[PDB]
């Protein structure tokens, strides 16, 4: 009668995916949901705020693990999570995205014969030296069910020999989340007011990929280029804390003061900032998709994206950070462009399709 | 001057590492660092192999073992990462498909250190086996894949792994059997010491978790061997977990009914295998080694990875569901031989492997 579905989350974007899935599982006939918070993101603005603003139940467990190496965090999450599984003995383990928490989750589970579904499965950058590419490859090959958000993602899984009956194209749960919480963003966020921004009167930026922040010359290119764009149109930049650290350590802190630099914001503010921006500059997966949701033109500061359909639809554009001025002009150019009318990522009911396929 | 750090953990890994490290010591500039995870620690599981196979002492003993999958794998992952940051090697070599293997590749790969997997591409197609998980994730984490068979090649291709990263080299355990044969022949007195002639017994090993962690399955086996014993003597070097399980379930008595030994060394094991009438096992290595010595095998599992042994009729599966049938299967196969065919290479898999590591750039 009752199925127990246990969710493993560690990072900001995982909390947001999980919020959408929880909603559907909460009001499901006979589903008990258990939520593990691995402790990977711990601060109030990377964690707590999302549980409160997206009405996510308090986690049944907080493993309190973070701030170490790949080896440390993965190893200790692996042991801790296994401990919890051995206690809760759930039917399904759900993991999301592609951090060390995603992998430790799946790997703890498969060795206990516990079914694993990967929510957001089959994305590839095809650069195997990326920790997130390894994480999503090893996760997919260890899961039993694979919830693909796009046709590309499906063909990626088939090509690595994963059979069709274990793959379900269900669209993207972060589109679910945008729809269902959009109205709540409307009535609660007052961030345009707090920062004194007129709608479509600024650009929005996020930057945190390690290939971008650990390399001094790439990070300088990016912060120079954003400061230049500020002169022409204000830049709002909720700065990931790792990015903040790396900028401070390489002595690029002045560029941040030269734009509208923020600590990280909750999802409601973010929606409200994403919605009312003229253009979005990012290296985030979630935010590139989100720009497209609101038909705001996007520039992705990478050599590739896993969300290729956004490039084909002309709503997103690649701009590797080789040159500061080159990147600035690319950003200012793409502001007066737009993509085609097209539906991606589904109807808003990816989460409900997931719940279905799990009974 | 290239550094190659090996990660080993258990009996079959030391046998594989021995064959390979013999070639790496002979190679100009090439320094080795050997890491022992501590997964096997009893002397007849570990130190004996180091002594008889002429393997230098490990540069590190992490002394992790005897916990859960999570505990072992997790603690190994952190520990091996710590070493790798110390030694910053150019290659990490991992072997087979223990939890040690996986902790190895996972440590290495997130540090952007190239990983090579010795014995790559094997698949049982049973994810209930912790070792099916281990080789799948290892192979997907590796930059070189030293497949031992054409099956293992094809397996890797179908999981969308590029042809350039896959080399078929044969099996280093064949290099081992070949290199150490004279020394076991000359130094093993195991036959004398038991009181056995050639062709006059049956040799048996059993340690698959899926056999030992289920009582009525283990009962099936122990009894099946006890019956066989009454007809042809059964020599049975017992794995420690197998013994401790036999005790946990109260099947102890069954081991009296055959020639139960503690675990033997490779030298003694070679002679036992060489001079047996039939081998029966749930072991990876022993299956192939039976074929090496042209001795019929029975494999007490639902599947094997070594499917070529079945097709050549050197091997036969018999899942343990019924004491009586398992015994009869065994006694029938005792009368069989497979076809003459050459598997697993020319005995120089280690040389090919060494070659490929040096010339990889
Ligand atoms: C490149 C890469 O691997 N990326 C993976 C990565 O996610 P990601 O890169 O998007 O990191 P991230 O940008 O912090 O989150 C965005 C969210 O934060 C919100 N967001 C952002 C900033 C902010 O101040 N406030 C806020 O609410 C935004 O509104 C938005 O909803 O980890 C994810 C995970 O494991 O689940 C994977 O799904 C991703 N994989 C992919 C393929 O996109
Ligand atoms: C089924 C499975 O996953 N198996 C994997 C597993 O090895 P395995 O099943 O063969 O365990 P094992 O039987 O302890 O050792 C045999 C050796 O011990 C010697 N041996 C055996 C008994 C004895 O008393 N004395 C002795 O010297 C024998 O002469 C023989 O040389 O770990 C291996 C590893 O990670 O490298 C993987 O390569 C294997 N994968 C495969 C696919 O064979
Ligand atoms: O030298 C050794 C190695 C293993 N074990 C036993 O084997 C169990 C599990 O061994 P492991 O998980 O390493 O797997 P194996 O490949 O030996 O089955 C441990 O809890 C020990 O009780 C032992 O007694 N001595």
Author numbering:
A (entry chain A): 1 to 359
B (entry chain B): 2 to 362
Authors' description from the paper:
The final step in the pathway is catalyzed by a 2-epimerase, which utilizes UDP-2,3-diacetamido-2,3-dideoxy-d-glucuronic acid as its substrate. The focus of this investigation is on the ORF WP_011172736, which we demonstrate encodes for a 2-epimerase. We have also demonstrated that the T. thermophilus enzyme is allosterically regulated by UDP-GlcNAc.
To determine whether the pH of the crystallization experiments was a contributing factor toward the binding of additional ligands, the next structure (Structure 5) was determined at pH 9.0. In subunit A, the auxiliary binding pocket was empty whereas in subunit B, electron density corresponding to UDP was observed.
